[PDB]
Automatic annotation (TrEMBL), chains B, E:
It is found in: Host cytoplasmic vesicle membrane; Host nucleus; Virion. Capsid protein VP1: Interacts with capsid protein VP0, and capsid protein VP3 to form heterotrimeric protomers. Five protomers subsequently associate to form pentamers which serve as building blocks for the capsid. Interacts with capsid protein VP2, capsid protein VP3 and capsid protein VP4 following cleavage of capsid protein VP0. Homodimer. Interacts with host GBF1. Interacts (via GOLD domain) with host ACBD3 (via GOLD domain); this interaction allows the formation of a viral protein 3A/ACBD3 heterotetramer with a 2:2 stoichiometry, which will stimulate the recruitment of host PI4KB in order to synthesize PI4P at the viral RNA replication sites. Belongs to the picornaviruses polyprotein family. This is Genome polyprotein. Capsid protein VP0: Component of immature procapsids, which is cleaved into capsid proteins VP4 and VP2 after maturation. Allows the capsid to remain inactive before the maturation step. It comes from the Viruses. It comes from Human enterovirus 71.
From TrEMBL, chains C, D:
Capsid protein VP0: Component of immature procapsids, which is cleaved into capsid proteins VP4 and VP2 after maturation. Allows the capsid to remain inactive before the maturation step. Capsid protein VP4: Lies on the inner surface of the capsid shell. After binding to the host receptor, the capsid undergoes conformational changes. Capsid protein VP4 is released, Capsid protein VP1 N-terminus is externalized, and together, they shape a pore in the host membrane through which the viral genome is translocated into the host cell cytoplasm. This is Genome polyprotein. Capsid protein VP1: Interacts with capsid protein VP0, and capsid protein VP3 to form heterotrimeric protomers. Five protomers subsequently associate to form pentamers which serve as building blocks for the capsid. Interacts with capsid protein VP2, capsid protein VP3 and capsid protein VP4 following cleavage of capsid protein VP0. It is found in: Host cytoplasmic vesicle membrane; Host nucleus; Virion. The chain holds residues 324 to 562 of 2193 of the full protein. Belongs to the picornaviruses polyprotein family.
Length: 237, 218, 239, 239, 218, 60
């Protein structure tokens, strides 16, 4: 154990489990000879790159899974939700940290992964003959996230039994509680609208159902603390 | 000991049929002896699920054109295959000046002349054609619409002022060359419902694969 | 001019011939290839990634589908009981179809290499016991019990000491040609067998669930290979 | 002879294929290329030349057409009033169509680079005052007034000190693809905005006209580029 | 980062259709089964305004010939395309000895044989074809007439003594190669009225581009 | 393009002409040639082997 601090944000965590650096690349910056060398893209250091600790979702036996969209989860929150809106372009990285606080008497397993361009396909009316486009609350669920309804196909017609092909890490309750991931900016472009485009999405599904005998706390507070890495903006409004 | 067959370029080459144009004499189908085919690589059934293994790709595509009559017969007819790059305007009529715009490459070949064949490049303005888009182009009917993936349009037509004398059928094959790909993702296990979205059939949600009776009986 | 003689093959259009063709836009400079994370070059990269093996590929009821992903172990199983069983058949139907490996295998005709199945005990942390996971090479018949399985390649897994255990499947080869129905399919016959027995019962103290689930992930070693592309799929682009 | 196999593409006539063809007059020695002044090599040379921006592109009456060329400023405008406004849209209609840059843009499909708009005060020499010319980057909405415009990229121009002032438009990119009507057009969306406010009123002593005009010239920086020729025109050769 | 697309040669290549010849059987149009087409590069609509950006240019031009029947059909007919350099005499009849003058290059090709294709050079005696001329060749009807810009004449005809058995249509494309240009000038903003002069319509004088309501409403 | 003149023989298919033809499967890597005992290279090898001569070729 030992506590780390980035500004006014002080979280208490374990020494250093095994972190997952998505695709082996580190969220670096974008050099001078890029497409906008005129409007120098200011790189937020001060408070912009600090610890955001979201409304802890509660695990249950019946939980299906949860997902947040990026950078959507923060374009609402704090002084980064200040730059994400009143700025024209954006490129960022993310130190995501997911923790569970449960006793050695609860059991379960959470798969935690990041998926680029996570396009939510709805059910489509049922029989398949309705071309319904997911609402805006499902496409960009804010920092409250959203519950998958069809975890097996990840609400996008794809087997989750294969999601491990993305950066992921496991949260087996009998072995670990904390799970950490480092995401590098990923897109077909060097910069992009931080409001109209969610580069990726954080997925955390219960693969082995939460269980416990009667008496043990029925819910497991999953705390998601995350912070921007070598994030960049350009063109104030 | 060799593993070259499993490379991306290997996996993806081969000309596959992605399009077929009917130019009947008597018809409800393409009545003006001409046709417009915005280039879709999903035309080869198999293809949609294959490419959707990745999020970003890049490539050139060699197109070959096979034309004849329905009985698969050859005839003394000339043809104009025209390519209207994205941005350029498609011909609205069998005499639209779009047929004459020099900036719309056109290749003329007699049906007898073996298949015409041309290479088209990586059009996209983005650094890569990307299959998925988690946003909207600056509940909306524009979700998942990655625009900058337009390869162009192929306008086909019999040459000449008058209607062609024969019933014609053009087939467009396409070999994908120089393929590079990024960000891999879960193989589509659910049936496809529309060309644009991953929308699946929430009723008919099927297990990825075959099932059995007990986890002890093989 | 210069003397020639056209040879047979002239004018043919081979869907596989990979020559060059004239560029439609000769002046056009296509927008530059920038750096994108995670570039895949050869598909075998993906075959070495672990994906959940739906060993418990039995429940089909729409909202139980999330169960094929993990089978369970409980207090109620007597010492020696068969917990589960499946074959080393990445291509053919069943459990392997859920693994990404299995899914790729479908675009290829022949293949061979060593596999690797890892098990994960996701039960209470207060649980202990032992499992006997045995591999009965191709040809060998499923061991009658836990004892006879104990004489062949096996591993006693004390999910009391280690939460995870990985087993290597030495070799599987789908190359023996079969012309059955009228449709000639290249099938295994190398159905290796992985059996799993309760070496001991599931011991858990008061206050801990009497049922844990286990997840089984699978991937192919680096000695894996594939040959002969064979585009095939039940899911194609709809009208 | 020598063995060949004609490949598909044989006999096709590509309007773009740029091979060589047999000379009609093999002996003919065409009269020598002498030196002529001002040779143009690449069109982008012309895109860097300043041409009058018809900002005041409103009068259409035949003999007032010479007015679209220059807008005016007068004593009658109170401090803070909006004098004029236009977008950073070289291709799309309006003010930019008069500039040579805009006109070239029409033979191309995509493009991007920094622009540069220079203003010229052609009023009496005895006049003074200040103007606030602000640029509201793409996406940013026209500032409500002179004050809010004063918080974003702006320039106080004292046509009392300098007769000319040049503003650089950092960047504009016409690359986002739109398939609206049925005709797929590559449009901006990067409509930057240039607003012009009366920072102070127009101060002129007795004997000097209470109205001056300003000419706005425009050109594209050197970082400019164009892609994909697209011959298009309303004016073609008549019968 | 590249700027090759905006070069003159790039801007101008591409074969564009600049001419079409009709040789009907029954007709008022070219009744003698032959035709004369003094080479005009204004045939491609777009072209006139493009070249008129400059005052002086220079180039070679590769011509390609596409011939068939009105339905765009191919037939077993032979053809004589003849080029009468400037100065030489054009054929006045379907039997004018001009058809036989060796100094008038001629290329014979069967309709079936793919398009005939030839390169013609920079004819002009002046150091450059010049689009504008502020004078008269040694109020006059000869103003702006730069003479030394003649590229030649293309005489087309069915081969043989007798009328051809079929209705024919020749199309002449033209790629401009090796283009050099000087003295740039204001893009034509007014509609064209005649092939020879800049004469515009003094009544219909239109603003260079779209207009708006106020210089404050976008 | 480049000038040619097709010579007689063009388009003929000689059952004996041994030129090369386009591969049907360009990517395919055929399974490796391993070592097998007794490889025959030229038939005359077999002509030097003794075989029983049916001199008494009379009983049928």
């Amino acid at each position: 154990v030992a506590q780390l601090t980035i500004g006014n944000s002080t979280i208490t965590t374990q020494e250093a489990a095994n972190i997952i650096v998505g695709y082996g690349e580190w969220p670096s910056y974008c050099s001078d000879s890029d497409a906008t060398a005129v409007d120098k893209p200011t790189r937020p250091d001060v408070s912009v790159n600090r610890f955001y600790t979201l409304d802890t979702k509660l695990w249950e036996k019946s939980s299906k899974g949860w997902y947040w969209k990026f950078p959507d989860v923060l374009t609402e929150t704090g002084v980064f939700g200040q730059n994400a809106q009143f700025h024209y372009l954006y490129r960022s990285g993310f130190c995501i940290h997911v923790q569970c606080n449960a006793s050695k008497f609860h059991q379960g397993a959470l798969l935690v992964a990041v998926l680029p361009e996570y396009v939510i396909g709805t059910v489509a009316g049922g029989t398949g003959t309705e071309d319904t486009h997911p609402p805006y609350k499902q496409t960009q669920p804010g920092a409250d996230g959203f519950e998958l309804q069809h975890p097996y196909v990840l609400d996008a017609g794809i087997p989750i039994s294969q999601l491990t092909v993305c950066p992921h890490q496991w949260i087996n309750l009998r072995t670990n509680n904390c799970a950490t991931i480092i995401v590098p900016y990923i897109n077909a472009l060097p910069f992009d609208s931080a409001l109209n485009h969610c580069n990726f999405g954080l997925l955390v599904v219960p693969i082995s159902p939460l269980d416990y005998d009667q008496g043990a706390t029925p819910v497991i507070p999953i705390t998601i603390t995350l912070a921007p890495m070598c994030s960049e903006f350009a063109g104030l409004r | 000991h060799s593993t070259a067959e499993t490379t991306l370029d290997s996996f993806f080459s081969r000309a596959g049929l992605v399009g077929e144009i009917d130019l009947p004499l008597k018809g409800t189908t393409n009545p003006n002896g001409y046709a417009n085919w915005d280039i879709d690589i999903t035309g080869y059934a198999q293809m949609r699920r294959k490419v959707e293994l990745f999020t970003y790709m890049r490539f050139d595509a060699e197109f070959t054109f096979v034309a004849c009559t329905p009985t698969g017969e050859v005839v003394p007819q000339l043809l104009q295959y025209m390519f209207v790059p994205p941005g350029a305007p498609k011909p609205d009529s069998r005499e639209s000046l779009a047929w004459q715009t020099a900036t719309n490459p056109s290749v003329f070949v007699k049906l007898s002349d073996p298949p015409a064949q041309v290479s088209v490049p990586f059009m996209s303005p983005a650094s890569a054609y990307q299959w998925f888009y988690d946003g909207y182009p600056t509940k909306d009917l524009e979700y998942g619409a990655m625009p900058n993936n337009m390869m162009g349009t192929f306008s086909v037509r019999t040459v000449g002022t008058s209607k062609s004398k024969y019933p014609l059928v053009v087939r467009i094959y396409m070999r994908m060359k120089h393929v590079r790909a990024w960000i891999p993702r879960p193989m589509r296990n659910q049936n496809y419902l529309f060309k644009a979205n991953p929308n699946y059939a929430g009723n008919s949600i099927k297990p990825t694969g075959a099932s059995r009776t007990a986890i002890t009986t093989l | 001019g210069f003397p020639t003689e056209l040879k047979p093959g002239t004018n043919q259009f081979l869907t596989t011939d990979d020559g060059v063709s004239a560029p439609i836009l000769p002046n056009f400079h296509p927008t530059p290839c920038i750096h994108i994370p995670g570039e895949v070059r050869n598909l075998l990269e993906l075959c070495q990634v672990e994906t959940i093996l739906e060993v418990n590929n039995v429940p089909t009821n729409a909202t139980s589908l999330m169960e094929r992903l993990r089978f369970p172990v409980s207090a109620q199983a007597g010492k020696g009981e068969l917990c589960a069983v499946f074959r080393a058949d990445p291509g053919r139907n069943g459990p392997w179809q859920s693994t990404l490996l299995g899914q790729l295998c479908g675009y290829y005709t022949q293949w061979s290499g060593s596999l690797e199945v890892t098990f994960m005990f996701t039960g209470s942390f207060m649980a202990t016991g032992k499992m006997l996971i045995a591999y009965t090479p191709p040809g060998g018949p499923l061991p009658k019990d836990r004892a006879t399985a104990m004489l062949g390649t096996h591993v006693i897994w004390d999910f009391g000491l280690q939460s995870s255990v990985t087993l290597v499947i030495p070799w599987i080869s789908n190359t023996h040609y079969r012309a059955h129905a009228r449709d000639g399919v290249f099938d295994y016959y190398t159905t290796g067998l992985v059996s799993i027995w309760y070496q001991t019962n599931y011991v858990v103290p008061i206050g801990a669930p009497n049922t844990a689930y286990i997840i089984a992930l699978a991937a192919a070693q680096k000695n894996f290979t594939m040959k002969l592309c064979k585009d095939a799929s039940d899911i194609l682009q709809t009208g």
